[PDB]
Symmetry: C3
Subunit: 36 residues, 3 copies
Amino acid sequence: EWEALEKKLAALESKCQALEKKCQALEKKLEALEHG
Amino acid sequence: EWEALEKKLAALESKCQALEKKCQALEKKLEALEHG
Amino acid sequence: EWEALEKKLAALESKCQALEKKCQALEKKLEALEHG
Ligand SMILES: [Cl-]
Ligand SMILES: [Cl-]
Ligand SMILES: [Cl-]
Ligand SMILES: [Pb+2]
Ligand SMILES: [Pb+2]
Ligand SMILES: [Zn+2]
Ligand SMILES: [Zn+2]
Ligand SMILES: [Zn+2]
């Protein structure tokens, strides 16, 4: 329903933000290997 | 419209879930290099 | 509100598309290390 859609969108926004940070952490490790 | 928004949100949820799994696969490869 | 939800969903769709491309760029670098 409407309220369930609002909550689903907020949960997806937060899941994507968390994935963006996980990828930034992966990138830091990859850059340490690339420049090692 | 409403129905199109519902479907767009479900498609985005699935795209993000697929990206999370792709990143986990990248992380496994990176960890093999980090610990090689 | 409704219009704010529509815009939030479009902004999230674009953020995810940008993250997918960033991960593809990370994967290219990782594959160069894996096959180096
Ligand atoms: Cl670390
Ligand atoms: Cl593998
Ligand atoms: Cl490059
Ligand atoms: Pb990633
Ligand atoms: Pb996402
Ligand atoms: Zn680099
Ligand atoms: Zn490690
Ligand atoms: Zn490879």
